[PDB]
Design an enzyme around this catalytic site. Sequence first.
Site, PDB file in Angstrom:
ATOM      1  N   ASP A 280       0.839  -1.190   0.000  1.00  0.00           N
ATOM      2  CA  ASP A 280       0.000   0.000   0.000  1.00  0.00           C
ATOM      3  C   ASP A 280       0.878   1.244   0.000  1.00  0.00           C
ATOM      4  OD1 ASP A 280      -2.080   1.806   0.188  1.00  0.00           O
ATOM      5  OD2 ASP A 280      -2.461   1.433   2.316  1.00  0.00           O
TER       6      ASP A 280
ATOM      7  N   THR B  32      -4.914   4.582  -2.202  1.00  0.00           N
ATOM      8  CA  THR B  32      -3.907   5.557  -1.796  1.00  0.00           C
ATOM      9  C   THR B  32      -2.763   5.615  -2.800  1.00  0.00           C
ATOM     10  OG1 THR B  32      -2.686   3.965  -0.442  1.00  0.00           O
ATOM     11  CG2 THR B  32      -4.524   5.128   0.597  1.00  0.00           C
ATOM     12  N   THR B  33      -2.333   4.458  -3.307  1.00  0.00           N
ATOM     13  CA  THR B  33      -1.312   4.437  -4.349  1.00  0.00           C
ATOM     14  C   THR B  33      -1.826   5.055  -5.644  1.00  0.00           C
ATOM     15  OG1 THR B  33      -0.714   2.319  -3.339  1.00  0.00           O
ATOM     16  CG2 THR B  33       0.499   2.963  -5.322  1.00  0.00           C
TER      17      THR B  33
ATOM     18  N   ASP C 260      -8.570  -2.074   3.995  1.00  0.00           N
ATOM     19  CA  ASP C 260      -8.761  -1.761   2.584  1.00  0.00           C
ATOM     20  C   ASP C 260      -9.988  -2.452   2.002  1.00  0.00           C
ATOM     21  OD1 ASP C 260      -6.384  -0.587   3.175  1.00  0.00           O
ATOM     22  OD2 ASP C 260      -5.189  -1.661   1.679  1.00  0.00           O
TER      23      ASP C 260
HETATM   24  N1  LIG Z   1      -7.618  -7.229 -11.449  1.00  0.00           N
HETATM   25  C1  LIG Z   1      -7.305  -5.996 -11.912  1.00  0.00           C
HETATM   26  N2  LIG Z   1      -7.035  -5.788 -13.220  1.00  0.00           N
HETATM   27  C2  LIG Z   1      -6.722  -4.570 -13.702  1.00  0.00           C
HETATM   28  N3  LIG Z   1      -6.652  -3.473 -12.926  1.00  0.00           N
HETATM   29  C3  LIG Z   1      -6.901  -3.531 -11.596  1.00  0.00           C
HETATM   30  C4  LIG Z   1      -7.247  -4.829 -11.001  1.00  0.00           C
HETATM   31  N4  LIG Z   1      -7.438  -4.610  -9.689  1.00  0.00           N
HETATM   32  C5  LIG Z   1      -7.231  -3.289  -9.455  1.00  0.00           C
HETATM   33  N5  LIG Z   1      -6.912  -2.645 -10.597  1.00  0.00           N
HETATM   34  C6  LIG Z   1      -6.615  -1.194 -10.725  1.00  0.00           C
HETATM   35  O1  LIG Z   1      -5.718  -0.792  -9.687  1.00  0.00           O
HETATM   36  C7  LIG Z   1      -6.123   0.455  -9.120  1.00  0.00           C
HETATM   37  C8  LIG Z   1      -5.908   0.424  -7.610  1.00  0.00           C
HETATM   38  O2  LIG Z   1      -6.602  -0.681  -7.039  1.00  0.00           O
HETATM   39  P1  LIG Z   1      -6.166  -1.258  -5.601  1.00  0.00           P
HETATM   40  O3  LIG Z   1      -4.847  -1.973  -5.773  1.00  0.00           O
HETATM   41  O4  LIG Z   1      -7.345  -2.012  -5.033  1.00  0.00           O
HETATM   42  O5  LIG Z   1      -5.966   0.078  -4.717  1.00  0.00           O
HETATM   43  P2  LIG Z   1      -4.560   0.568  -4.093  1.00  0.00           P
HETATM   44  O6  LIG Z   1      -3.895   1.307  -5.228  1.00  0.00           O
HETATM   45  O7  LIG Z   1      -4.977   1.454  -2.945  1.00  0.00           O
HETATM   46  O8  LIG Z   1      -3.828  -0.680  -3.658  1.00  0.00           O
HETATM   47  C9  LIG Z   1      -7.576   0.678  -9.513  1.00  0.00           C
HETATM   48  O9  LIG Z   1      -7.768   2.012  -9.995  1.00  0.00           O
HETATM   49  C10 LIG Z   1      -7.875  -0.346 -10.593  1.00  0.00           C
HETATM   50  O10 LIG Z   1      -8.183   0.294 -11.836  1.00  0.00           O
END
Ligand SMILES: Nc1ncnc2c1ncn2[C@@H]1O[C@H](COP(=O)(O)OP(=O)(O)O)[C@@H](O)[C@H]1O
Lengths: 520, 538, 538
Positions: free
Chosen positions: A55, A88-89, A386
């Site tokens: 994160d 957050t990222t 999260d």
């Molecule tokens: N399985 C997936 N395939 C493609 N893009 C994804 C997938 N899961 C998440 N994302 C992308 O990653 C971004 C961040 O998601 P997430 O990792 O849940 O949040 P964080 O950046 O806080 O860890 C989202 O905007 C989404 O578009």
Amino acid sequence: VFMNASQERTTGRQAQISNITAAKAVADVIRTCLGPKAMLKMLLDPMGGLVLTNDGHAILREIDVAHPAAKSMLELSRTQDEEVGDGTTTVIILAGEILAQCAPYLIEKNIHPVIIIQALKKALTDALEVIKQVSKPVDVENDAAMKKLIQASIGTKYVIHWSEKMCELALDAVKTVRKDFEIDIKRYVRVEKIPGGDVLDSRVLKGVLLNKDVVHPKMSRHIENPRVVLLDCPLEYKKGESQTNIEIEKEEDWNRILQIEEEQVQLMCEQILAVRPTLVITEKGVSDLAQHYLLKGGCSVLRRVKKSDNNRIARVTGATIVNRVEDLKESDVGTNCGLFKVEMIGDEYFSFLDNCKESGLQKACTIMLRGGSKDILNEIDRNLQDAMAVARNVMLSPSLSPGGGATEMAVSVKLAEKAKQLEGIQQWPYQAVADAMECIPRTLIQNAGGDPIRLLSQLRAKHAQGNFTTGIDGDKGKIVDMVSYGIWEPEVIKQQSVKTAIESACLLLRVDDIVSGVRK
Amino acid sequence: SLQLLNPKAESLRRDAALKVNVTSAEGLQSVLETNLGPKGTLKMLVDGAGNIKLTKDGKVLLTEMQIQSPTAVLIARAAAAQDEITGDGTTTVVCLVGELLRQAHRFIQEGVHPRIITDGFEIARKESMKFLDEFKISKTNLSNDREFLLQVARSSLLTKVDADLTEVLTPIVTDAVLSVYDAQADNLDLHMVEIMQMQHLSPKDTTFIKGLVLDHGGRHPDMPTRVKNAYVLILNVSLEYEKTEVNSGFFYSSADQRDKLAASERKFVDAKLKKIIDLKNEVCGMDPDKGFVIINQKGIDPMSLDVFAKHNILALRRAKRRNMERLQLVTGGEAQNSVEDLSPQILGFSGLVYQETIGEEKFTYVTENTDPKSCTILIKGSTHYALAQTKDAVRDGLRAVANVLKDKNIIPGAGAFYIALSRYLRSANMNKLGAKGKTKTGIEAFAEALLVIPKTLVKNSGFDPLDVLAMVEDELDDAQDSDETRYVGVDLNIGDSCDPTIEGIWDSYRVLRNAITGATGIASNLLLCDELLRAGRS
Amino acid sequence: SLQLLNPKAESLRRDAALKVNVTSAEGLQSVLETNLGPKGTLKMLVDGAGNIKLTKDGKVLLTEMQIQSPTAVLIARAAAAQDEITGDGTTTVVCLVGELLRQAHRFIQEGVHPRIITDGFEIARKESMKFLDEFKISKTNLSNDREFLLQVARSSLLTKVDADLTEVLTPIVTDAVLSVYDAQADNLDLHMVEIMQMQHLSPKDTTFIKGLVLDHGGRHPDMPTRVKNAYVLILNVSLEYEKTEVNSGFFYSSADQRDKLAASERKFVDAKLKKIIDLKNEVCGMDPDKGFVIINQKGIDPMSLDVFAKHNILALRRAKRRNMERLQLVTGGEAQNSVEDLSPQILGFSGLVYQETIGEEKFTYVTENTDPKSCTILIKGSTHYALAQTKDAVRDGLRAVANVLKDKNIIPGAGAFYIALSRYLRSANMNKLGAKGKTKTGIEAFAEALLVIPKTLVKNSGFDPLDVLAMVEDELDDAQDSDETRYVGVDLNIGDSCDPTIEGIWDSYRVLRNAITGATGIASNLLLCDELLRAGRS
Ligand SMILES: Nc1ncnc2c1ncn2[C@@H]1O[C@H](COP(=O)(O)OP(=O)(O)O)[C@@H](O)[C@H]1O
Ligand SMILES: Nc1ncnc2c1ncn2[C@@H]1O[C@H](COP(=O)(O)OP(=O)(O)O)[C@@H](O)[C@H]1O
Ligand SMILES: Nc1ncnc2c1ncn2[C@@H]1O[C@H](COP(=O)(O)OP(=O)(O)O)[C@@H](O)[C@H]1O
Ligand SMILES: [Mg+2]
Ligand SMILES: [Mg+2]
Ligand SMILES: [Mg+2]
């Protein structure tokens, strides 16, 4: 000499160049920490611990940068974490690009840093419009869709393999804290950890989990229907507020002074036995003597319990915070307690309090975590924050935006199309907003190992013709629509990402000079 | 990106972060590689002055030697956390994470992604959980087989200590564990079983005492040493003076009021002693044959010790919290804290109470109970490290044998579990599994990593590790077709296979379950990490 | 034990010395393997003096950068002997030693002795020679075809610079060995070509000159730069004042003898120069369009330049030692030191001689020879580092094309020999074993370590190595289903197999010989090394 300044004044254009390079450097640290194939990050704090996570917020908490422009970028993660709790990222990686794309112009085409700000608010106003149009509503009572909505964020973490259990774990916890608008808060969500065990047998149980055992051995370790009563006060005689000084003249006074110490603890214990409780939870410590007659009625005494753990017990058992013992009645006594039982674990003892399960005050609960080690517990605990953060947005806002970069790519296409019809001086910064919004799918393709040249070219060709829900599959690296892919995220996270990223650029773009070492 | 931000920092990324986690893993593995097994080498730890403490437990080695690497501190918490609740499997976790990283790192160099590799470990882990159900065997506790408990006790004790200490200390554990099983079937280890240090003749003279032993005795000489029938009394009341909440001067006027007042001061103690005398009057019959003893949790005033000495009542002061929670189990009585309400029912029973002293210290022995619900294990030793070695051996031995009675299953060891998972993962049809793509090597990497543990046992004996598995592989090839279900082992005495069912080598159920679960989580998290950095205010 | 002899000494033995040897080899491998292939990266050797230099050869990278580790010094010395005798394949040596130590150490950790491991490498090495002599192909170089030499030169020069500069420079390499050939004696010299460092238009604007090019110009303006027909004359004695060796001095009796004794030095200058003037008009007097040039190794008197300037004589000085052999090969003359005997037969011939003023210096160009047995290559560039980069490219490309004439056999490249040698070293049935279950461990390690070369090329191109090799092992197998020699390669443009032969990629026979022999010897001796030591007197 003159005042404490003028060491090396970075003035003019080179000052803003260092800020764009410094703001870009913050995003480069966590460039690989995005998407489903994201890499982990072990940071070494100077105290002696260790933080294992991916994160962006938890990474940027431990890092320390001695630069004032990068610290404003550091604070944006606290804006996202303490607003929703997810993405957050996404906030840190988007802003870097916005500051970077606007830079060409600042450096070369000489557009003053205020005209860019006016261009971004109209882009911000149009960004909320297309994000409102691209999002589709979803039913809140559908548990089948709610499990797939909760596990969208879990898919980018380590516990995607246990996603079948985490969605059931998070869904039951959110509905417990949810009050019948639909306001919930994570302060009652207990983050108690148990090192060791298997994740499959780990389950949420209605009620609390203490770290302590009973004091006396004869206390009942298994009660059918406990009746909990919370106490704040010391149950023991205490010194008292004013300057006291008893002066003893006769020999029959000192034994009387020590005898009333026994009778006062009898008086407070006997009035507790008017309602005949089974479990007496005291906030402060307990004496060896009062406990003895608490025993002569059938109660159970515990050690000092901190305040926090009593406010959760007040909502579970339905009791009230009570300090004055003389005003103890039968109505404020906790009831409808399911079961009482103490398990043996080598670390410490653990007393279980189960609820009968059958409007009123919102109920609390404790989520059991059975990880592999200490870092696995802290890793999984942040995943629940999260994952449970996603469940709040669908209740506060029934809208649901597409994931996989489809939402931000939709902002890129409409801003690019409308930039031609926006003829004037605002056209160059307005068109540069689309250049950064198409990077958050570009980062997914880079982590997946594919070529983002032809994928983004194929993306824009099919986005206008095919549908508005097109996106990139992070695992396979091919164009797959979000409808068939079955993964969706809330629209509230998309709003905070666009708002916080653009509003951060408006602050940092106004920086002219940097002067360090003035005073404390 | 970090140098222009922070003026001073260190950063490793994308090749050194992988080499660090593997190099630190192979380094820490080499430390605990030689200790694993029965013929392993001992390891002392002398810190500052030269305090000596000797044991083979990996937890003591990790939680006493300070370590600077960021990878090993996670292996230290993982090896410690698994052992702190289970009591066994410490070095097994280090060997799995120590081997699974290097066994996957060769394929990272080939260019396979870390994400899909760890996806293969997780889906392979679920196959091992399904295999534990078929691999385990049911055992009914109603038989009360004492020979089965003796063989389980020798599994852990042979690893730590030699055969001379194992044979004399094995039935000490079995007699303590034989009383654990009851109708309620509720296990209780910390309150029931205890350890106490005592510098005495030798480690071989460790004996089992059915009652609760205490580290104190009678202060006065005239008080009785030995008592035949001693009825105990529990009182948590403090009988020295009580200071009294702000109470101040006994303002005395003439000189006499002074004597009067000192006498007064005592009256509080005599008010409580009279209740003991009134209780003794009810049980006054057969006073020379029978006896009475009082055990207090807090201190007793020396002025009041002469009162007990005149009535030949044995006095013991300043007991532990745990001992007050154990007198009811041993003597069978009930606890009491105040002196107002007394009865003869709460008094316990004891068949023999005697004291023995050495040097300045004195110990009180209680035994010969009618129906003791608890007991103790008084370990003898020569040196301080001898007690520490027996501390870790008894601490790890009681937890290993206690877990067998918690569940109705037991896992045979001696490499049978690891060798069985090797053939299962290497011969199972992949179409039944849901993993596809580049998960081919992830199954082979984790399946091949389990083989290094049973040959680490051979590396301490000095034989060729690859050759002593040849007949083991040939045995299982014919065992499946021969229609005979048998489990092979690894005997280090002769360098040939064996059967743990008849030899008595066994292992607990939750040890191997929690070990692979904790090891797979730590090893997976270390593989996905591709950058190391240090930053903060100090 | 070593501390008792020398307290200031150190020693790593039997586990720390092995990790040092493998980690230093893998550390040297990870840095230097990136230069392998055409898609490799360029390194900037920036020393303390600010000298910038671009290169991809491992010899010059390790020569400028001093090596601190003792293991990598042995590998750098192997690259020196490889570059010395051959001049190509240094990156394959460090990768083979790094992979052989990696694949060997994988088995040393399994409990195998290093002796039988190295025994398998030698049997695998001898087995590769019995595979190499059958794998090579013989061609007839008597035709002197230009198409084969161009594609063979293009394979070596593509690994130094990009495509557009390779196409311009690849005819320069083929034009280097046009006339230098002897069928009977089989003598072919590489040092006769002259590499001149100069700044001009661009690196991509270079060209080949048939004759010789000297870096010395005409001192006097009066002498003609353009000469249509020149007869060279080789001088070696210095025409200036040479102090009489035996110390001496001119003590004149009166002022009238001062200019006469000054004229005594003029007589010895006129004495040796009169034969030069007589040599000119001996051929033909009053012959326009016929000059006469003189090439002297030592200096020329500036007082004597007026004598050469009046008769239109080109005079150059401070020539190199190796150029004296190159004059007679190009111009067809004869070398002379003194001027006692002169004739027109000893004089050479030239069809065109001209000079060009480039900066503050002048370069002499001698072209249009009848049957020159030598030539030169002008290394033009836009900077200082491009001269050294193109110089290393030519010096590495001259050896690849020169080995085709030294031995007619040539091996196809593109990793064809390493892929084909992997299958042959899989199963040695009863040919060369030596022992049961001992030598075969080294045969497997040697076969798996040779396939890192085609995988390293794929890692630089940016594709998956296992996927592109799956069709490749496959192609070779389907080829086998036909009993035909279909040599397969690795194409880095699309990530698919290709024919090395058809497409245009070859390797020299002596590169793979010394590389496998040198890598196997260094890999064997480093495995045999069990302890590192240091000792000396500061
Ligand atoms: N399985 C997936 N395939 C493609 N893009 C994804 C997938 N899961 C998440 N994302 C992308 O990653 C971004 C961040 O998601 P997430 O990792 O849940 O949040 P964080 O950046 O806080 O860890 C989202 O905007 C989404 O578009
Ligand atoms: N006498 C023996 N014969 C065969 N195997 C043994 C013997 N003693 C111990 N082992 C094996 O050594 C392994 C480790 O045992 P133990 O010391 O209890 O755990 P750890 O080494 O993780 O602390 C077990 O899997 C067990 O099967
Ligand atoms: N165009 C090419 N395509 C495929 N392989 C090549 C090509 N050029 C060179 N190679 C391979 O690279 C290896 C080393 O060649 P080269 O780079 O010229 O030597 P060095 O590595 O010493 O610089 C050869 O064995 C050859 O198989
Ligand atoms: Mg997320
Ligand atoms: Mg053990
Ligand atoms: Mg080469």
